[PDB]
């Protein structure tokens with residue numbers, strides 16, 4: 321629900337789909353890769 | 369803007385267009 325913000329202070333809510341997009345950005349992938357493929361990543365994750 | 373889910377409609381301001389024109 322809040323990613324990593326609650327470990328440094330107050331828990332700050334953000335939608336999870338947006339949490340995943342920041343995480344791809346942290347590894348050098350542009351954030352539209354998730355937003356345009358949200359269903360594919362969620363379905364592939366669920367099987368994995 | 370027809371593949372991302374959750375898009376909202378809003379105006380994006382370009383600073384060049386007004387001043388230039």
Ligand SMILES: *[C@@H]1O[C@H](CO)[C@@H](O[C@@H]2O[C@H](CO)[C@@H](O)[C@H](O)[C@H]2NC(C)=O)[C@H](O)[C@H]1NC(C)=O
Nearest residue numbers: 369370371372373374375376377378379380381
């Ligand atoms: C965001 O703006 C677009 C463009 O004006 C809207 O698309 C129109 O939506 C109406 C129905 O609400 C349709 O009758 C039109 O044919 C659509 N236009 C096009 C070019 O497809 C879109 O609905 C807006 N989104 C919201 C949430 O209001």
Ligand SMILES: *[C@@H]1O[C@H](CO)[C@@H](O)[C@H](O)[C@H]1NC(C)=O
Nearest residue numbers: 335337358372373374375376
């Ligand atoms: C968010 O969930 C509501 C139902 O609580 C739904 O109607 C809406 O379409 C959802 N928004 C997005 C962007 O999926």
